[PDB]
Amino acid sequence: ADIQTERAYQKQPTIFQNKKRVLLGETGKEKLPRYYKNIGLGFKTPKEAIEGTYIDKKCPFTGNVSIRGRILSGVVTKMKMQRTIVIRRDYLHYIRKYNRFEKRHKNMSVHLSPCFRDVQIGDIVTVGECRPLSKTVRFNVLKVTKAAGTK
Amino acid sequence: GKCRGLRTARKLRSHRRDQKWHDKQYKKAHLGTALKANPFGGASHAKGIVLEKVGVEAKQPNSAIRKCVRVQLIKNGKKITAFVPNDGCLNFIEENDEVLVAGFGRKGHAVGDIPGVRFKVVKVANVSLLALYKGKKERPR
Amino acid sequence: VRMNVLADALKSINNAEKRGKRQVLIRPCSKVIVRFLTVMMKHGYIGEFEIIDDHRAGKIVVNLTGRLNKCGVISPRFDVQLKDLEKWQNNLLPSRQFGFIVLTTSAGIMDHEEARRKHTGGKILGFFF
Amino acid sequence: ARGPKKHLKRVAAPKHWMLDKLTGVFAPRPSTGPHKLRECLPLIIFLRNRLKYALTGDEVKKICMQRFIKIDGKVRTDITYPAGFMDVISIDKTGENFRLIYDTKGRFAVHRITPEEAKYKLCKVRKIFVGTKGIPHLVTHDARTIRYPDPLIKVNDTIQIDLETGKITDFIKFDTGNLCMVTGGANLGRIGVITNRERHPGSFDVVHVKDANGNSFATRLSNIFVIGKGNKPWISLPRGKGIRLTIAEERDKRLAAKQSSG
Amino acid sequence: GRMHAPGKGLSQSALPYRRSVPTWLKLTSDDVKEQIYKLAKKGLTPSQIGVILRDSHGVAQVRFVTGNKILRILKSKGLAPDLPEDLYHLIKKAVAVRKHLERNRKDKDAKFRLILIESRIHRLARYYKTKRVLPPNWKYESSTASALV
RNA sequence: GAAGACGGUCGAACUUGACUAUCUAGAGGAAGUAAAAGUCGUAACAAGGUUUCCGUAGGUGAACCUGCGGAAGGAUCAUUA
RNA sequence: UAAAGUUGCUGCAGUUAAAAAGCUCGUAGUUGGAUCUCUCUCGGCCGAAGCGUUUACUUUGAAAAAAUUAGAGUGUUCAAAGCAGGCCGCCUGGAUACCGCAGCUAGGAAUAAUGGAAUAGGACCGCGGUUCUAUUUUGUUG
RNA sequence: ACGGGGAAUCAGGGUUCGAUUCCGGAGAGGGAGCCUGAGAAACGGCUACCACAUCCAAGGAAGGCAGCAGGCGCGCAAAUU
Numbered sequence A: 001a002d003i004q005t006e007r008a009y010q011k012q013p014t015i016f017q018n019k020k021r022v023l024l025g026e027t028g029k030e031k032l033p034r035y036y037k038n039i040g041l042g043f044k045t046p047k048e049a050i051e052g053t054y055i056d057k058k059c060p061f062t063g064n065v066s067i068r069g070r071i072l073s074g075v076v077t078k079m080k081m082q083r084t085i086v087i088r089r090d091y092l093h094y095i096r097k098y099n100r101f102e103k104r105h106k107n108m109s110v111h112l113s114p115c116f117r118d119v120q121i122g123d124i125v126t127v128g129e130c131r132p133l134s135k136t137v138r139f140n141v142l143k144v145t146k147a148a149g150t151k
Numbered sequence B: 001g002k003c004r005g006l007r008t009a010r011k012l013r014s015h016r017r018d019q020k021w022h023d024k025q026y027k028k029a030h031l032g033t034a035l036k037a038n039p040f041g042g043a044s045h046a047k048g049i050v051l052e053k054v055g056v057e058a059k060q061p062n063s064a065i066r067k068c069v070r071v072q073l074i075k076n077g078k079k080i081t082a083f084v085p086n087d088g089c090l091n092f093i094e095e096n097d098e099v100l101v102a103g104f105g106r107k108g109h110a111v112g113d114i115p116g117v118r119f120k121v122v123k124v125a126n127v128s129l130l131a132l133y134k135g136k137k138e139r140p141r
Numbered sequence C: 001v002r003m004n005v006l007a008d009a010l011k012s013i014n015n016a017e018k019r020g021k022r023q024v025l026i027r028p029c030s031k032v033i034v035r036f037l038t039v040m041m042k043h044g045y046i047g048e049f050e051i052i053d054d055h056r057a058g059k060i061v062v063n064l065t066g067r068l069n070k071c072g073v074i075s076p077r078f079d080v081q082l083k084d085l086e087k088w089q090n091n092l093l094p095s096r097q098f099g100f101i102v103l104t105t106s107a108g109i110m111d112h113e114e115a116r117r118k119h120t121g122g123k124i125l126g127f128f129f
Numbered sequence D: 001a002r003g004p005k006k007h008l009k010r011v012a013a014p015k016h017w018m019l020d021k022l023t024g025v026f027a028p029r030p031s032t033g034p035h036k037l038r039e040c041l042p043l044i045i046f047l048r049n050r051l052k053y054a055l056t057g058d059e060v061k062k063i064c065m066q067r068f069i070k071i072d073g074k075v076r077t078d079i080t081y082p083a084g085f086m087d088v089i090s091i092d093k094t095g096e097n098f099r100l101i102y103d104t105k106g107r108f109a110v111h112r113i114t115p116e117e118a119k120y121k122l123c124k125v126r127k128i129f130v131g132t133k134g135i136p137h138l139v140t141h142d143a144r145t146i147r148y149p150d151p152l153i154k155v156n157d158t159i160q161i162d163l164e165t166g167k168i169t170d171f172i173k174f175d176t177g178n179l180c181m182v183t184g185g186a187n188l189g190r191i192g193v194i195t196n197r198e199r200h201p202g203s204f205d206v207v208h209v210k211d212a213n214g215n216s217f218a219t220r221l222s223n224i225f226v227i228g229k230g231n232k233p234w235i236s237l238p239r240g241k242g243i244r245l246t247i248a249e250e251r252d253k254r255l256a257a258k259q260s261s262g
Numbered sequence E: 001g002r003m004h005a006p007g008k009g010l011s012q013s014a015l016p017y018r019r020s021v022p023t024w025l026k027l028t029s030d031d032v033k034e035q036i037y038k039l040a041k042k043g044l045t046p047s048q049i050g051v052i053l054r055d056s057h058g059v060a061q062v063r064f065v066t067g068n069k070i071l072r073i074l075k076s077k078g079l080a081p082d083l084p085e086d087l088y089h090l091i092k093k094a095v096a097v098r099k100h101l102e103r104n105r106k107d108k109d110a111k112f113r114l115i116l117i118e119s120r121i122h123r124l125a126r127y128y129k130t131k132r133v134l135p136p137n138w139k140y141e142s143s144t145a146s147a148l149v
Numbered sequence F: 001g002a003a004g005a006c007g008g009u010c011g012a013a014c015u016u017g018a019c020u021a022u023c024u025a026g027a028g029g030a031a032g033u034a035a036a037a038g039u040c041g042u043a044a045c046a047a048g049g050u051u052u053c054c055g056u057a058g059g060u061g062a063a064c065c066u067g068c069g070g071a072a073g074g075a076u077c078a079u080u081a
Numbered sequence G: 001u002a003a004a005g006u007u008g009c010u011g012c013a014g015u016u017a018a019a020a021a022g023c024u025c026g027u028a029g030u031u032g033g034a035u036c037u038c039u040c041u042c043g044g045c046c047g048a049a050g051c052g053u054u055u056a057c058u059u060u061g062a063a064a065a066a067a068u069u070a071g072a073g074u075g076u077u078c079a080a081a082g083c084a085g086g087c088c089g090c091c092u093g094g095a096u097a098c099c100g101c102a103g104c105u106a107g108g109a110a111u112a113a114u115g116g117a118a119u120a121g122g123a124c125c126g127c128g129g130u131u132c133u134a135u136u137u138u139g140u141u142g
Numbered sequence H: 001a002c003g004g005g006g007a008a009u010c011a012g013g014g015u016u017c018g019a020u021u022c023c024g025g026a027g028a029g030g031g032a033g034c035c036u037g038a039g040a041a042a043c044g045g046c047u048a049c050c051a052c053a054u055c056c057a058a059g060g061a062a063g064g065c066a067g068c069a070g071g072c073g074c075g076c077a078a079a080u081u
Helices: A047-051 B009-022 B024-030 B033-037 B129-134 C005-018 C031-042 C084-092 C112-117 D043-050 D057-065 D247-261 E029-042 E046-055 E062-066 E070-077 E085-103 E108-130
Strands: A071-078 A084-095 A100-111 A124-129 A139-145 B045-057 B065-073 B079-083 B098-103 B119-124 C023-026 C049-052 C059-063 C071-073 C100-105 C108-111 C122-128 D069-071 D088-091 D096-099 D111-113 D120-131 D135-140 D145-147 D158-162 D168-172 D179-182 D191-198 D206-210 D216-220 D224-228
Touching: A071 A100, A084 A124, A084 B009, A100 A124, A100 B009, B009 B024, B045 B079, B065 B098, B079 B098, B119 B129, C005 C023, C005 C031, C005 C071, C005 C122, C031 C049, C031 C059, C031 C100, C031 C108, C031 C122, C084 C100, C084 C112, C100 C112, C108 C112, D043 D057, D043 D069, D120 D224, D135 D158, D158 D224, D179 D206, D191 D216, D191 D224, E029 E046, E029 E062, E029 E070, E046 E070, E062 E070, E085 E108
Parallel strands: A100 A139, B079 B119
Antiparallel strands: A071 A084, A071 A124, A084 A100, A124 A139, B045 B065, B045 B098, B065 B079, B098 B119, C023 C059, C049 C059, C071 C122, C100 C108, C100 C122, D069 D088, D088 D096, D096 D111, D120 D135, D120 D158, D135 D145, D158 D168, D179 D191, D179 D224, D191 D206, D206 D216
């Protein structure tokens, strides 16, 4: 697919893609190295990140974002922006006078890289905290676990 | 019966909070209408100007003239009626002089056989009614 | 519908013991019911009981020895820490000399004294005295 | 507030300074220096409150302005100078030397050391980095920078600095079986052998320390300071050797001391 | 009690304690499976197949002879119906009630019973969607549900 | 290199709009409360002298009356092949 | 504020004293029957890894200003207080606990939720097929 | 309604309070805009407008106590220039 759907050229800023080509420099292939990094904390770089072609500067694996801070989990509830999803974290808040709990939830707008295709509503996502990416986004989707019902 | 579930805290707290408004004292304290209607405006005492001496008839089972005064409060220009407690103490009050009035002791309710009167005079002309009654002090000249 | 089969079992035992009956039938049986009954019996409060095995959900015939004043359930199963145990004992037990609060802890189902011995907390199932 | 603060309230001061609640409104705000505000001991507190050499801050000022106090071998005339862990305070006029070392209660002790021990100190290396033509540099807990350190010295190790020259002489690796003090937290002032280190990536590592008396405790890796190689300290320890007694044992010792004394 | 009635009836089957094949019963498990296949090919629901096997062939319980339930056998052979028979019969009853209500518009009792039937339909359909027995987009609409019948 | 000027931007400002403010211009209109009930009746409490009450509708100096359906909290737990 | 179990979570009431919707259906909310008991470099089966099934709960360990409250010591002449002081230069204190919820950590695995194998694109096992594969050339790479 | 540490009361639960000396935030009559500086949108700095207000020879000049005292006003309500 064409990765150049923007008014400006999309590229990985750390990759030089027009190193000089000559007869010896080209033998039936142009070649294009792919910048990717191994984020920490045991998270493995998805295969599509390594062998993909998308340009996403907020992607944890091939972009310019450092995963540091809280590592949370949520359930995907809305996928209707570009490269951003809304997940819902459900918890119980303890009211002490009644010695009981009440259901509460918080929505979280988190960045989803193009490396995670086939993400559905109800999927569980492990997200990691990064620097502010937009007005409301501060977490990047690190891992996707499909909801029970995969067959 | 009532709900007994580990996740009913919202239900219990909200039901208690809604049902507290049917408590007359809680509603009177937290609605703000009573504070607005209170001539003292939340104060324990208030200074006022005596407009006239008024005699209030005791309620039907009893029979007397309760010697009160109509006063206008300096703070808000409201007109109240205040009992002059002891005997001969109405003679200690003139017209158009300043009096300190307090509540009558029921937190805004009438006391005894004095209809519609919920205040009592404490001072007159910056001298307490007790001092004038006991002769310890005299009103200024 | 019926929730809390242990509540039904305890209410049945209580109602039968208050009528002075010698045995009580409990249905359905469950592991929690059997453990609660075992705790009651180890302290001499009920006596022997038989688990009738039908292929759906067993029944229990509990022999009653009239030493039981009240066996009750605590719903919901509040989580109880070792600090809150004294307050629960004051609330539920008739005396500090006798009576037991039954907890389900990770070490099993046990009375409150045994939970203090193992230095563990858990969830309150009920009480008996 | 605009700009930095310049005052410290008496009640908001670090508790281990052991200041009153009636001798004024302010505590001496320690100057910026090699040690943090809440982990230091100002020179005025040491000279007045600890050693009783002065009865007022004016007398501390007189003592310090006569150039009588050396801190790590250098004369300090700043009465609010932040002196901290492992530092050496020399008073040559009275011919004494002290090391700033925590008590088991978490408070800097008046720990006198020999004049030959006052020639060195121990510093925990906070970071190591290569700069400017590949020269390695090392930064310790005194905020002092040492160029060309041994390529074996890493973060969390301890190095013995010669105060006269400022150069490294020896070093202790951070490893199990090594003696260490605790320099923060609940176990502050305790000494023991490192037994384990739980690594928590992306978070704080936890180091387990076993006392000389069989007691065990844990701290954050930033709260550990390697004192000696093996179970032999490289510095003289305070009266208590880092053994935190329970309140009962302390009461028993106090009663025994009362019986022996009166 | 009933889900949609004040009835508190107790009438139901009472399985015997023994889970074994009766001594009188000489049909092999495969014989019961082929009889089930024949009855299903005839166009019968699993309840009807079980009733016929109990009444005529003496099969007290198919699960105890074949080690499998009738619907599971029908699915495994590949001739189980598209939607479960309880939901199918509920939809059929709803269709009948709607057909009656089309020509009898003054029957408020029929409208009330239709409401009850469709509530039961929706509850069962939600349960089936939870179990992935029905597609998640399946919905009961009362416009062409007679085709589902 | 000062005054000054164009433009930009931030932007306080007598912006030509709905005055939740008790206060008064209120004579006003219709309602609640202790009435020498003063007067006129007696609707309810006894089968209260037309059993009472509920909903709805009309009518009336006034309590109320009347129609339709309902309840007993009735003045019937009962009336006989 | 207690008394007020007259706001009732503990812990209230609702036939007649104030009070249960005219009656059903119904989404959210709340609540839900039984059931499952020896694996990475080692010089101590003798340092280690999890790559495997998640939480709630409970216990523990870190980290968590002081002042206040609780609380140890100490004859302010006593006490409220204070953090002092004690002995004939010396001796000694300036403790300790609690710090809820959320976050971090490590044991337990009853209780409660949750998960896999049902068109087997299921577990283990050896076979058929592909890669510069940080060396599988002390020799100048080829 | 500045928030918290915390306070009063309290058998176990709880109720009410926290302007107030410690920590954090905000403001300096109300808004706004800046200079200097490491640090201020600072007011015991400046610039303007709005409100108030001081001196004047009418040309002009100057202002900001929610700092310590003190005064007036306000009030039931709070101290020494």
